[model samples]
Target: DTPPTELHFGEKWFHKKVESRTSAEKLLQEYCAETGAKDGTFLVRESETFPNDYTLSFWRSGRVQHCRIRSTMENGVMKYYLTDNLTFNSIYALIQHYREAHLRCAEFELRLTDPVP
Candidate 1:
């Protein structure tokens, strides 16, 4: 009896507004437009590097970055793994965590302010 009833085992498990920003080349330029270049404008999408994986693509100081979000099961439960090596019980639960707290990465600290449109 899981709280989340919508997750099928085969779902993509990403943002509903996601696009094919698979490569950062064009979106790299696209990410650098004049407005909202402040911090933590993100896009969640399918992982380009690994099958059944997702990406947390966010912007900070006009620069874009990708942090892989590995979705899998753990201890008989759903898990969302961040590059920070921290894991959570569900997708929205982790997103809410980042919304209120920082993703303390080895290279930088990150917090989600908004999602890219």
Candidate 2:
């Protein structure tokens, strides 16, 4: 059964929730808008630290920017981290962090692409 967003953090294997590319990109758009930074391409790649986990990366001002979400198995339990500092057990938790940050999407056209397969 699908658990409520607030209670998602305590559960493991919520992979389906965050697997949507749309949700991730939406968050990225908001982030860019809030920062006054222009939008660029975003690529998804497999996470080196966690098997089956993925990373969202993009270029900004000729510099690469990395998203904070990551997952790794700890003692057989999956754990997620944000900004490499805080840990969460659910994708909802990670998304909530960005939500609270309250970033904005660009008013102009923003290009986002997935080049990594």
Candidate 3:
């Protein structure tokens, strides 16, 4: 199995193909910064602004876009949501969902194909 850029509790349960903040911040932008990156190349990373929160970042329209993933401890169990709409118990569920079709975020239709592993 492939290792992770950042260790997390959830990653122990299921594999989440994502990059870390340091790499994204670096000049070595694999997909997020490259103009040749595919429209759907994506990876989830630790939010630069919000610590303990996540940012669902992907490449589109020759650039990288960011959409914050909101989370809260409701009824003792954590829940995550992209917007005020549909929410899920796990981050993987949210990732699995938008892959089927374009997920509206940051005013762009994000249809993720590659996981940016």
Candidate 4:
């Protein structure tokens, strides 16, 4: 049996566990439902050379707010965050932050395009 992966946000109540291989989309959907936040777009980029590794961009508040996601591995687990000092344990955490920081009725368009390389 595959072990469940635990995800913890800022508080004890924002805790979740999922079977291994859960997609980021599923996690973000759950986060939106739980926090009652408007869904936004996610854009990602990666390069083989020059600032290697993955970088993610999130847009919300009708393009009023934009955030860049940076990731680092700690003890085998990947952690993502927006601010330099504050690190989120998962992508869901960053999504939560985006929703809270930028709450509005207008929804932004999400492009269905190939990931940048």
Per-model lDDT: 0.63, 0.50, 0.60, 0.43
What's the TM-score of every candidate structure? 0.62, 0.36, 0.61, 0.35
Per-residue lDDT of candidate 2, residues 1-117 (tens digit):
342323625433233444445554565565565677654544444444455565554446545455535566778766765444466666556555544663232221247778888
| Model 4 lowest lDDT segment of ten | 1-10
When sorted by TM-score, best at the front, the candidate numbers are 1, 3, 2, 4
lDDT: worst 10-residue window of model 2 = 101-110
Residue lDDT tens for model 3, 14-117: 32334555554342255346456556666676566765567776666645667777777779877877875687776777777888867866334356778777
Winner on lDDT between 2 and 4 is 2
Show the lowest summed lDDT stretch of 10 residues, model 1: 1-10
Clashing pairs in 2: 30-104, 33-104, 34-104
Error of 4 at 29 (Å): 22
Q: Taking the tens digit of each residue's C-alpha lDDT, what string does model 1 give over 17-100?
A: 454555542464576566555477676676667766667777777567777777787788767767537788766667768879
What does candidate 4's lDDT look like per residue over 22-116, in tens digits? Answer: 23335545555456565455433331222423334333433323233456677987676555556666655655665577522112334577977
Whole-model lDDT, model 4: 0.43
User: Highest lDDT, which number?
Assistant: 1
Model 2 alpha-carbon miss at residue 66, Å: 3.9
Better of 2 and 3 by TM-score: 3
Pairs clashing within candidate 1: none
